[PDB]
């Protein structure tokens, strides 16, 4: 079963813990990867009910299970805060433009 489903991509809690660790280490190093420079700040204008406080940062989670290292980021993201707490799993799949919906 999937712990998180984004569109038709299925992720387990191991997949999310692995992506968050990689994204949080780049935040501590003051580094980014990719043409769109991830991780970067996430603004919660859609109002998802996250139970952890901001600031928030978005980082890609790949359907393949690999950690993101550049190239296409796909449409799914883990959002974590400044204290390395997971806020949620969201995706651009099924939302217009740069908006997001939550994975279920
Ligand atoms: Ca997986």
Curated annotation (Swiss-Prot):
Record has Hydrolase as a keyword: yes
Active site location: 40, 58, 92
Reaction catalysis annotation: [RNA] containing guanosine + H2O = an [RNA fragment]-3'-guanosine-3'-phosphate + a 5'-hydroxy-ribonucleotide-3'-[RNA fragment]
Key words of the record: Disulfide bond, Endonuclease, Hydrolase, Lyase, Nuclease, Signal
Enzyme class, spelled out: lyase
GO molecular function: lyase activity; ribonuclease T1 activity; RNA binding; RNA endonuclease activity
GO CC terms, sorted: cell septum; hyphal tip
UniProt-listed Enzyme Commission number(s): 4.6.1.24
Organism superkingdom: Eukaryota
Residue pairs linked by disulfide bridges in the UniProt entry: 2-10, 6-103
Family per record: Belongs to the ribonuclease N1/T1 family.
Subunit structure: Monomer.
Record's protein name: Guanyl-specific ribonuclease T1
Organism: Aspergillus oryzae (strain ATCC 42149 / RIB 40) (Yellow koji mold)
Taxonomy of the source species: Eukaryota, Fungi, Dikarya, Ascomycota, Pezizomycotina
Gene name as annotated: rntA
Span covered, complete protein: 27 to 130 of 130
